[PDB]
Amino acid sequence: MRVLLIAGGVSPEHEVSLLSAEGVLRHIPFPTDLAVIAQDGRWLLGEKALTALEAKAAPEGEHPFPPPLSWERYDVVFPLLHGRFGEDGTVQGFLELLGKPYVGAGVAASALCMDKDLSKRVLAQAGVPVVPWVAVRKGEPPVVPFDPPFFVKPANTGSSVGISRVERFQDLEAALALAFRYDEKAVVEKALSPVRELEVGVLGNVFGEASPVGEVRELLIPAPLDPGTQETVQELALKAYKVLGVRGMARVDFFLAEGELYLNELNTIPGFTPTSMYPRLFEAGGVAYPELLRRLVELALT
Amino acid sequence: EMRVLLIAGGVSPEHEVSLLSAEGVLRHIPFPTDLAVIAQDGRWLLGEKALTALEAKAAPEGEHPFPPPLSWERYDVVFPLLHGRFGEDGTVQGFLELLGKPYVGAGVAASALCMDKDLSKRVLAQAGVPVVPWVAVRKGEPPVVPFDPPFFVKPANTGSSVGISRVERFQDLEAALALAFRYDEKAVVEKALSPVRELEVGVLGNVFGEASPVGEVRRAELLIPAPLDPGTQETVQELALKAYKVLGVRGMARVDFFLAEGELYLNELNTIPGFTPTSMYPRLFEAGGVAYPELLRRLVELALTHHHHH
Numbered sequence: 001m002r003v004l005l006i007a008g009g010v011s012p013e014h015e016v017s018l019l020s021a022e023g024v025l026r027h028i029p030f031p032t033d034l035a036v037i038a039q040d041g042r043w044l045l046g047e048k049a050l051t052a053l054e055a056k057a058a059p060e061g062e063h064p065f066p067p068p069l070s071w072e073r074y075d076v077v078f079p080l081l082h083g084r085f086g087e088d089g090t091v092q093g094f095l096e097l098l099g100k101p102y103v104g105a106g107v108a109a110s111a112l113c114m115d116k117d118l119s120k121r122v123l124a125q126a127g128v129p130v131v132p133w134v135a136v137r138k139g140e141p142p143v144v145p146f147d148p149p150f151f152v153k154p155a156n157t158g159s160s161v162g163i164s165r166v167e168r169f170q171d172l173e174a175a176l177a178l179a180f181r182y183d184e185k186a187v188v189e190k191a192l193s194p195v196r197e198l199e200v201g202v203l204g205n206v207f208g209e210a211s212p213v214g215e216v217r218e219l220l221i222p223a224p225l226d227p228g229t230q231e232t233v234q235e236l237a238l239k240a241y242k243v244l245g246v247r248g249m250a251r252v253d254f255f256l257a258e259g260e261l262y263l264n265e266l267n268t269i270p271g272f273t274p275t276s277m278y279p280r281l282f283e284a285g286g287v288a289y290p291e292l293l294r295r296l297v298e299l300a301l302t
Numbered sequence: 303e304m305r306v307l308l309i310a311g312g313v314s315p316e317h318e319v320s321l322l323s324a325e326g327v328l329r330h331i332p333f334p335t336d337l338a339v340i341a342q343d344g345r346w347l348l349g350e351k352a353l354t355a356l357e358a359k360a361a362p363e364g365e366h367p368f369p370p371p372l373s374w375e376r377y378d379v380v381f382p383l384l385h386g387r388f389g390e391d392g393t394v395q396g397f398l399e400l401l402g403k404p405y406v407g408a409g410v411a412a413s414a415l416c417m418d419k420d421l422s423k424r425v426l427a428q429a430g431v432p433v434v435p436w437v438a439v440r441k442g443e444p445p446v447v448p449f450d451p452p453f454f455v456k457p458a459n460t461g462s463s464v465g466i467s468r469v470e471r472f473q474d475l476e477a478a479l480a481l482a483f484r485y486d487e488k489a490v491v492e493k494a495l496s497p498v499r500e501l502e503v504g505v506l507g508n509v510f511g512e513a514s515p516v517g518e519v520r521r522a523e524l525l526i527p528a529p530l531d532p533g534t535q536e537t538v539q540e541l542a543l544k545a546y547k548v549l550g551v552r553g554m555a556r557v558d559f560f561l562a563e564g565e566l567y568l569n570e571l572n573t574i575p576g577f578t579p580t581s582m583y584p585r586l587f588e589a590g591g592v593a594y595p596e597l598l599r600r601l602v603e604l605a606l607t608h609h610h611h612h
Binding site: 041065066085088089090091092093094096097098099107108111112114115118121122124125126137138139140156184185206207242243244245 | 344368369388391392393394395396397399400401402410411414415417418421424425427428429438440442443459487488509510547548549550608612
C-alpha cells in the first residue's frame with residue numbers, strides 16, 4: 001500500500017501546505033513519498049521534494065504539469081493543497097482521470113464547497129442556516145438588501161485574499177473591485193458582530209461522524225457551548241456534509257451570534273499540522289493523529 | 303496562428319455520440335483543429351489514429367494512458383466534446399485548468415453542478431426556478447419518498463438515460479433503486495409527469511448569455527420554433543438565462559424543460575450538448591441567425607475571452 005502525498009501549491013497557502021505535509025509524513029502509518037508543487041506551477045519530485053519541505057518553501061519547480069511521476073506505483077494520493085488548484089476540484093479531476101483513489105472530497109464536493117455562493121444556495125435550500133448573502137457578478141452592479149457591516153469576498157478564491165470588511169455602503173464599490181481582481185463572482189455577507197467562531201471536524205464518506213466542537217478566540221476544545229447548541233452544531237455539520245456529498249473529511253466552520261447558528265464554510269483540505277484545528281478536534285474525540293491518517297487513506301479506497 | 307484541440311469519444315456510454323459530434327464540428331470549425339480521441343478503455347488515440355477512429359465511429363481501445371503525450375503548447379483552445387461522466391462532470395475541465403489551457407464550455411463547478419440532478423435542482427429551486435419534485439436517495443440510507451408513484455428513478459450523475467426506470471408501484475422501487483446504484487452512489491427519485499412536452503433552449507455566452515428560439519421534441523421531430531403561446535416562449539427563455547446565470551455557466555448550454563399541461567418545469571442543463579450539424583443545439587441557434595460555423599467561432603472566442611481577460 002504505497003501512498004503519494006502532494007503538498008505546496010500555487011495558492012497563498014503554499015507555506016502552510018508544506019507544514020501540514022511535515023506532520024502527516026511523521027505519523028502516517030503507510031509508506032509515503034512526497035511530491036511538491038512549487039509556487040510557479042512546476043513540480044518537484046524525489047529528494048528534490050524533500051529538499052523543498054525542509055526549507056518550508058519552494059519558489060520554483062523543475063517539471064511542468066503534468067510531471068513525469070510513476071502513478072502506478074501508488075495506491076492512494078493525498079492531495080494536501082489548500083485553496084485554488086487544491087480544494088477546488090482541479091487536482092481532483094486530474095486524479096480521477098489518472099484513475100487513482102485519493103483522499104478528500106471529489107470534484108463536485110470540492111468545487112461546491114469552494115464556491116461561497118453556490119454552497120450557501122445548496123445549504124439554504126436543504127434547511128441549513130447560513131449567513132445572509134448576495135452574489136455580485138463582475139459588470140453587474142450589486143443589489144444588497146441588508147445594511148453594513150458587510151464582508152465582501154471572492155466566491156472561489158479562498159485563502160482570505162481579496163476579502164473586505166465593509167463598514168459603509170459607499171465603500172462597497174471599492175470592495176467589489178478588489179474582489180473582482182481574483183474572481184469573476186463575489187459574495188456580500190452580512191457581518192455578524194459580535195460573533196463567536198465555532199469549528200467542528202467531520203470524518204467519513206458522505207455519512208460522517210462529527211468531532212467535538214472547537215472554538216477560536218487560542219482554540220478551546222471542547223468549546224464552551226450549552227449542550228443544545230453543541231448537538232445542533234454537530235447535526236448541521238453532518239447534514240451539510242451529507243447534502244454536499246463530501247468524502248474523506250471536512251472542517252465545518254460556524255458562526256454563533258445572539259444564540260443563532262450560521263454555517264460559514266466547509267473546508268475540504270483543512271490545516272494538518274499536529275497543532276492545526278482539524279486533527280486536534282479529533283484528538284479530543286479519541287482519534288489519534290496517526291489513526292486519523294489511516295482512516296483518511298482507508299476511506300479513499302472505498 | 304490559432305489552433306484548436308478537439309477531444310471526443312470518452313469512456314461514458316455516449317462515446318459514439320461524441321464521435322458523431324466531432325465529425326460534424328471538424329467539418330465546419332473555422333480554425334486549424336487537431337483531433338484527440340479518448341477510447342472506451344480510457345486510453346488516448348492521437349494523430350491519424352484519432353481520425354481513423356472517427357471513421358469507425360467507435361474506438362474501444364486506445365494507445366496512450368492518461369495523461370496523453372500531447373504537445374499542449376501548440377493548442378490555444380481545447381474543445382472538450384465529451385458527454386457524460388469524465389467529460390461533462392468537471393474532471394477534464396479541472397485537468398485543463400491545471401494545464402493553463404483555455405477550453406470551451408462550462409468550468410469545473412458549473413459542469414459538476416449541472417451534471418448532478420440532485421444538486422442542480424437544489425440550486426435552481428433555491429433561485430425560484432421551477433423543478434419537478436424530487437428526493438435524493440444515497441446508498442444505505444433507506445428510501446424516504448414524499449410522494450406517490452409514478453416516479454422516474456435516475457442516477458444523480460447519469461450521462462444519458464442509463465439506469466433510469468419509470469416506477470408505477472412502490473414494490474418496484476427497490477429494483478429501480480438498484481439499477482441506478484450500478485452507475486452512481488447517489489440517486490434521485492423525481493415525480494413522473496404525464497403527459498409531457500419536452501422543450502429545449504440553447505444559450506450562448508459567458509454567464510450572461512443569449513437564448514435561442516425554443517424548440518420542442520416529439521426518430522424525434524424538432525419543432526422550431528415550438529408551437530407555444532407567446533408568453534410561454536419568453537418565460538422559457540428567461541428561465542434558461544437566469545438558470546444559466548445562477549449556475550455560472552460559460553460558453554454554452556442546452557437547457558431542457560418539461561411542460562406537463564400548463565405546468566412548466568426546468569429539467570436539466572446540458573453543458574456539452576450534441577453537436578452534429580443536425581443536433582438540437584446547432585439547429586436551435588441556426589434558427590436564431592447563427593450559422594453552424596459562426597456558432598463554433600463564437601464558442602472558441604468565448605473560451606479565449608474568459609481565460610485571458612477574465
